[PDB]
């Protein structure tokens, strides 16, 4: 199946009593880990920003702020809610077995400093899984960055598949 295999969702925690309002607004990607690509170009991946804008139907208008080919680019997507609060899906859901195929899950957050979000994306009998370490600033302490590595490694990711996107300023500073 996978070169670097995926963990079961039974081994991925869910942030208890998820406050979708407190989680809203801009997050900087301080850390990124996963079994997929971790670079856009030939150099290490540069920091990007994700804005979770809570709609009235309690889905997220999610906007990724990207600095690519010396211009600002914006990926706009819809995180539709799943079974529990803090879980979301992406695109048109076909099956109930394949309702978990494109899924986002908030692991932990204190809402006003740090957050950890799990991504699942199936692609031809293989699963891309990522862990995003979010910050309200571009900096986070060694303890929080160490917690991210420990949790990343615990889901079966080597150290060379865990990166801390190089902080930038263009586009992501609003």
């Amino acid at each position: 199946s996978d070169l670097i295999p995926a963990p079961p969702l039974s081994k991925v925690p869910l942030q208890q009593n998820f406050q979708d309002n407190q989680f809203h607004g801009k997050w900087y990607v301080v850390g990124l880990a996963g079994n997929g690509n971790l670079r856009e170009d030939k150099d290490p991946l540069k920091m990007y920003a994700t804005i979770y804008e809570l709609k009235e139907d309690k889905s997220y208008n999610v906007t990724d702020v990207l600095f690519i080919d010396k211009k600002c680019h914006y990926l706009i997507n819809t995180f539709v809610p799943g079974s529990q609060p803090g879980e979301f899906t992406l695109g048109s859901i076909k099956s109930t077995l394949g309702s978990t195929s494109r899924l986002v899950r908030v692991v932990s957050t204190n809402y006003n400093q740090h957050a950890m979000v799990f991504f699942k994306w199936v692609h031809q009998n293989r699963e891309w899984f990522y862990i995003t370490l979010y910050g309200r600033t571009k900096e986070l302490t060694s303890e929080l960055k160490e917690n991210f590595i420990r949790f990343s490694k615990s889901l079966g990711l080597p150290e060379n598949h865990i990166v801390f996107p190089v902080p930038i300023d263009q586009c992501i500073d609003g």
Partner: protein
């Protein structure tokens, strides 16, 4: 020495603006992406339609006039010449009323359309195009008659020119009737998309079609226009890619098939998506997974569809058995479709496709094959569609007698003639 369209895959580009983006004009911008198209090893581009067409007005439809939006006649000559240097031929789609509901105008106007077509064919042939495509021929009064006329018109002016017919039909008899009306005519259809997608059904469809078309050089597609990922379930995309490249004939793809690109959702206006060169032209895919679903993203990725497409397309281009080899189906376990490609004493190619979501023994039976074709004890694995196995066993020797396949796994193995 064989026809140029025997030598590799065809690559359909319906919306030149969507393939290029907002950065440049359709025809001029297409020229700049030829280097990329060379890496895919495609032998022909099926472009357009690009001609002037006022929705459902026959007198305001000119098959010789290029939509000025896309570019000029001068821009199109540059493309033809640029492509010629790369050994890439240009097919022009001339489906007349492509902006309207009835593709061939009203049934009673067939006679007027045919005269417009006759005139168009001569002009474009002079301009230096190497063939033409006609889609929705199910909506054309006397399609067999007109396709024949247009072949006669094309052949009368040159020998080494290709005509492609398209249909929405998945019906064997309908497809054969159109094929038999005209010689050396490729026909794209929904034949391979109208399926339970079980191994026995896939084997049945392929073997029945080859039995009906006998010795004729077939084409292999999943539709006349649309993306493969819109018709084939996600779990079979790699398996179908292997199937299409290794069946005897010319495989036909649309731009984005090498990426696994999907078109408009069932709740959107049915119009072609942007070719995602980078993340500045992708839709419905957020970070961080978006990093994996662009041309730039899949380019360096060993386990991407773009890598499998390039690998299989390269083999299809240079191996004589895959270029113009005979085909023999093998007996195997239920829902495994195994077959051999062979030309004279050149390398044999053994293909084994597991269409089940479980480990399965191939149980290959080769007893009824012609003399001189015998399975050896072991054979070289060139490509598994299972990325896990490909990263561990590519270019390794596998024992055939106890051969087992992973869920939805496809194997391409190689073995030489033994003298």
């Amino acid at each position: 020495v064989q026809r140029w369209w025997h030598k590799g895959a065809l690559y359909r580009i319906g919306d030149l603006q969507a393939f290029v983006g907002r950065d440049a004009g359709g025809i001029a911008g297409l020229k700049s992406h030829l280097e990329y198209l060379s890496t895919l090893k495609v032998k022909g581009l099926v472009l357009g339609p690009i001609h002037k067409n006022q929705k459902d007005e026959i007198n305001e439809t000119d098959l010789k006039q290029i939509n000025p939006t896309l570019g000029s006649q001068e821009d199109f000559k540059d493309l033809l010449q640029s492509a010629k240097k790369k050994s890439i031929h240009i097919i022009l789609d001339l489906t007349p009323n492509y902006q309207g509901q009835n593709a061939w105008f009203l049934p009673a106007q067939a006679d007027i359309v045919a005269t417009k077509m006759k005139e168009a064919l001569s002009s474009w042939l002079q301009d230096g195009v190497d063939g033409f495509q006609f889609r929705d021929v199910g909506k054309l009064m006397n399609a067999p008659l007109y396709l024949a006329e247009w072949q006669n018109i094309t052949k009368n002016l040159s020998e080494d020119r290709l005509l492609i017919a398209g249909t929405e039909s998945s019906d064997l008899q309908q497809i054969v009737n159109i094929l038999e009306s005209t010689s050396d005519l490729l026909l794209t259809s929904s034949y391979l998309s109208n399926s339970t997608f079980t191994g026995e059904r896939t084997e049945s469809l392929v073997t029945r079609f080859l039995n009906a078309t006998g010795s004729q050089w077939c084409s292999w597609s999943v539709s006349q226009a649309g993306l493969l990922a819109d018709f084939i379930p996600d779990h079979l995309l790699r398996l179908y890619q292997l199937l299409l490249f290794t069946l005897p004939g010319t495989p036909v793809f649309s731009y984005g098939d090498e990426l696994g690109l999907q078109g408009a959702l069932p709740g959107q206006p049915a119009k072609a998506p942007l070719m995602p060169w980078n993340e500045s032209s992708i839709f419905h895919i957020p970070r961080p997974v978006s990093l994996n679903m662009t041309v730039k993203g899949q380019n360096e990725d060993p386990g991407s569809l773009l890598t499998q497409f390039r690998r299989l397309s390269d083999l299809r281009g240079k191996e004589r058995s895959l270029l113009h080899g005979d085909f023999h189906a093998l007996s195997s376990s239920p829902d495994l479709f195994s077959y051999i490609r062979h030309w004279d004493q050149n390398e044999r190619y053994l293909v084994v496709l597991n269409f089940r979501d479980s480990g399965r023994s191939a149980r290959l039976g080769a007893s009824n094959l012609p003399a001189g074709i015998s399975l050896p004890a072991s054979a070289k694995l060139l490509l598994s569609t299972d990325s896990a196995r490909q990263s561990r066993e590519e270019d390794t020797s596998l024992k055939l007698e106890n051969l087992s396949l992973n869920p939805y796994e496809g194997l391409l193995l190689q073995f030489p003639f033994v003298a």
